From a paper:
Peroxisome proliferator-activated receptors (PPARs) are ligand-activated transcription factors belonging to the thyroid hormone receptor-like nuclear receptor subfamily 11. PPARs form heterodimers with retinoid X receptors (RXRs), recruit coactivators, and subsequently bind to specific sequences on target genes, termed peroxisome proliferator response elements, thereby regulating transcription. PPARγ is mainly expressed in the adipose tissue, colon, and macrophages and plays important roles in adipocyte differentiation, lipid metabolism, glucose homeostasis, insulin sensitization, and inflammatory action. The ligand-binding pocket (LBP) of PPARγ is a Y-shaped pocket with a volume of 1300–1440 Å3, which is much larger than those of other nuclear receptors.
We tried to determine the SB1495-bound and SB1494-bound structures by a soaking method from the same crystallization condition to exclude any possibility that crystal packing affects structural changes. Unfortunately, we could not observe reasonable electron densities of ligands from the soaking method. Alternatively, we determined the structure of ligand-free PPARγ LBD from the same crystallization condition for the structure of SB1495-bound PPARγ LBD by co-crystallization with the coactivator SRC-1 peptide (60% v/v Tacsimate, pH 7.0). However, the crystals of ligand-free PPARγ LBD belonged to the space group P21212 with the unit cell parameters nearly identical to the crystals of SB1494-bound PPARγ LBD. Since the crystals of ligand-free, SB1494-bound, and R35-bound PPARγ LBD belonged to the same space group with similar unit cell parameters, the SB1495 binding to PPARγ LBD would induce the structural changes in helix H2′ and the Ω loop, resulting in a different crystal packing.
Numbering used by the authors:
A (entry chain A): 207 to 263, 275 to 477
B (entry chain B): 686 to 696
The structure:
């Protein structure tokens, strides 16, 4: 009933808060100025990047890309701990848990990256940097084209005005996708997803009662996400080939090989 | 295969 679905929403929200250092709430406070914290160091060019080494952790495009690579691995780790909190996930066949993460994590990375983004740029290093969109486009190819589709997506997605409590359920729904290639036992995955989808719908009616068919708009975006992921795998396929002075992190190698 | 993913899950 309604009560059970509310309890699921809250269990997931609490779990989201623990798993993810920088929430959409903190990120929006930073981006609009309303936090009382020191504003993020702005990285709008080659020099500002250089001066900003002190606030974050061979050639420039490549160094940015390898920074993006470090953060992804951490995201994958955070998303993995979050999954394990989704009721019934750890009782699935372990090979299915792996498959779900393999195909889901980048979809959640782009969903959650939108929390950190406006039309002008993206917070980095847990809100203490802000790397402009023009700077990321200005990078020499193929690195110029890497982040721009994530900005395009974020701009539309941010218009739905979801908060953390909505996003916690949406992300869980994405992870429990019964149509991922190679799943061994779909039915228990779908049973959990059906339950999350009802929890998401109730949440969207309660938390945005003036927004009608937010639930439906939000499901349509789950398909947009698969595109950006496929588009992204192919640019990475290109980068793997056309560049040599850079190795992909082993965890990201696991995820991307034999993927879409 | 997926040794790290396995490790992160079994943790």
């Amino acid at each position: 009933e309604s009560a059970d679905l509310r309890a699921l929403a809250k269990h997931l929200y609490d779990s989201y808060i623990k798993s993810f250092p920088l929430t959409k709430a903190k990120a929006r406070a930073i981006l609009t100025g309303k936090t009382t914290d020191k504003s993020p160091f702005v990285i709008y060019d080659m020099n500002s990047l250089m001066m900003g080494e002190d606030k974050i952790k061979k050639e420039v495009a490549i160094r940015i890309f390898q920074g993006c690579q470090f953060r992804s691995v951490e995201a994958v780790q955070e998303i993995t701990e979050y999954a394990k909190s989704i009721p019934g996930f750890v009782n699935l066949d372990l090979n299915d848990q792996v498959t779900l993460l393999k195909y889901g994590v980048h979809e959640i990375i782009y969903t959650m990256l939108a929390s950190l983004m406006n039309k002008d740029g993206v917070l980095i290093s847990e809100g203490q940097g802000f790397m402009t969109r023009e700077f990321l486009k200005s990078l020499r190819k193929p690195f110029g084209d890497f982040m721009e589709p994530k900005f395009e997506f974020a701009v539309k997605f941010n218009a739905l005005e979801l908060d953390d409590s909505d996003l916690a359920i949406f992300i869980a729904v994405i992870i429990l996708s019964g149509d991922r290639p190679g799943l061994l036992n779909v039915k228990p995955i779908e049973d959990i997803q059906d339950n999350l989808l009802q929890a998401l719908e109730l949440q969207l009616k309660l938390n945005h009662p003036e927004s009608s068919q937010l639930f439906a708009k939000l499901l349509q975006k789950m398909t947009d996400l698969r595109q950006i992921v496929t588009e992204h795998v192919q640019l990475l396929q290109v980068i793997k080939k056309t560049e040599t002075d850079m190795s992909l992190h082993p965890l990201l190698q696991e995820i991307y090989k034999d993927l879409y | 295969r997926h040794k790290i993913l396995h490790r992160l899950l079994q943790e």
